[PDB]
C-alpha cells in the first residue's frame, strides 16, 4: 500500500502546513490590531493639537480685531 501511503503522507503534510499558516495568520492579525490602536491613539493626540491650533486662530482673530481698533486711534 505505497500508493495510498504516499497519498496519505502528502495529506498529513497539508495538515501541518495549514495549522502553521493558522498560527501565522493569528499573529499578522494581532499586529494589525496593535498597529491599528497606535494609529487611533495618535489621531486622538493630534486631534487635540488641531483643537489647540484652532483656538489659536480664534485668539488671533479677536486680537487683530483689537489692534484694528487701536491703529484707528492713530489716524
Amino acid at each position: 500500500r505505497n500508493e495510498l501511503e504516499e497519498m496519505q503522507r502528502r495529506a498529513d503534510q497539508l495538515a501541518d502546513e495549514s495549522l502553521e499558516s493558522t498560527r501565522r495568520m493569528l499573529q499578522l492579525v494581532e499586529e494589525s490590531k496593535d498597529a491599528g490602536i497606535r494609529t487611533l491613539v495618535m489621531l486622538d493626540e493630534q486631534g487635540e493639537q488641531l483643537d489647540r491650533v484652532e483656538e489659536g486662530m480664534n485668539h488671533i482673530n479677536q486680537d487683530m480685531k483689537e489692534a484694528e481698533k487701536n491703529l484707528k486711534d492713530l489716524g
Partner: protein
C-alpha cells in the same frame, strides 16, 4: 496527534475571525475621525487665510 491538530487550528482560526471583527470596527472609527480632522483642517486654513489678510493689511498700514 492530528485530530487535535485540526481541533487546534480551528480553535485559534476562530480567534482570527473575532479579531478581524475588531479590525473592521476600528477601521470605521479611524475613518469617521479622519473625516472630521480633514474637515477641521479645511476650516482652520480658512480662518488662517482671514488672519494673514488681517495681518498683511495691518502691517502695511503701519508704514
Amino acid at each position: 496527534s492530528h485530530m487535535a491538530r485540526e481541533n487546534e487550528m480551528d480553535e485559534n482560526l476562530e480567534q482570527v475571525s473575532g479579531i478581524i471583527g475588531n479590525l473592521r470596527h476600528m477601521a470605521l472609527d479611524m475613518g469617521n475621525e479622519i473625516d472630521t480632522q480633514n474637515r477641521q483642517i479645511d476650516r482652520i486654513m480658512e480662518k488662517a487665510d482671514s488672519n494673514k489678510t488681517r495681518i498683511d493689511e495691518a502691517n502695511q498700514r503701519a508704514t
